[PDB]
Ligand binder design. Structure first.
Ligand code: HEM
Ligand code: HEM
Ligand code: HEM
Ligand code: HEM
Length: 101
């Protein structure tokens, strides 16, 4: 259902139950062959740990930025909230976010 990306020391969570209307492929994208179901931060994938790095190797980049070939966590949440200001706050705000729990 909803996992916590914490191999050792790092809080966060993704509930597969609240995202049932999205195709698995949108997130688990087809790369250099087929759809890979491995963790996003493995060796040879998104392992770069510097936030100024905007290449496809960046970790902070693929989770927070807006201009990308595949929609990011923040990228898709903006379209979903639309004109509801109270809801845009809850899904894209930095302070006290449910994404970092
Ligand atoms: C579609 C119904 C769907 C499938 C299938 C799928 C599978 C899947 C697996 C096997 C894992 C576990 C990997 C592990 O052992 O850590 C997993 C994990 C994550 N998923 Fe997923 N997933 C499906 C759907 C979705 C959707 C639509 C998204 C994006 C909103 C998504 C995202 C992720 C993420 C992030 C993880 C966590 C990986 C981690 O680093 O812990 N999944 N999924
Ligand atoms: C884990 C479910 C996962 C996420 C989340 C994710 C996101 C993601 C984005 C948003 C991009 C766009 C980058 C850009 O600058 O436009 C992107 C691109 C690539 N990814 Fe990825 N990705 C996830 C997982 C994986 C895994 C497991 C690997 C390693 C096999 C991987 C690799 C790549 C590569 C390569 C690209 C670029 C592909 C291209 O068209 O050149 N991703 N990912
Ligand atoms: C990126 C890996 C990512 C994370 C992390 C994430 C988290 C997240 C949370 C915590 C919620 C809030 C649920 C709650 O209130 O308990 C949530 C909800 C929605 N999301 Fe999401 N989400 C991530 C990725 C994505 C992507 C890429 C999309 C779109 C393709 C997406 C969509 C949604 C939708 C829909 C919701 C529901 C909003 C509602 O009206 O309840 N998320 N996400
Ligand atoms: C608001 C734009 C915002 C900020 C700023 C922010 C910061 C932040 C940091 C510094 C990290 C740690 C990076 C590292 O590698 O050490 C981090 C991690 C994650 N975030 Fe975030 N974040 C902000 C907002 C959001 C929102 C609204 C979401 C969900 C839609 C989101 C998601 C994530 C995810 C996933 C991670 C990785 C979690 C992990 O593996 O520990 N952030 N964020």
């Amino acid at each position: 259902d909803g996992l916590k990306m914490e191999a050792t020391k790092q809080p966060v969570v993704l509930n597969h139950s609240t995202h049932k209307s999205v195709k698995c492929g949108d997130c688990h994208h087809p790369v250099n062959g087929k759809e890979d179901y491995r963790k996003c931060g493995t060796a040879g994938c998104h392992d770069s740990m510097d936030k100024k790095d905007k290449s496809a190797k960046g970790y902070y980049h693929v989770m927070h930025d807006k201009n990308t070939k595949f929609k990011s966590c923040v990228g898709c949440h903006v379209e979903v909230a639309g004109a509801d200001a109270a809801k845009k706050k809850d899904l894209t705000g930095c302070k006290k976010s449910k994404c970092h729990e």
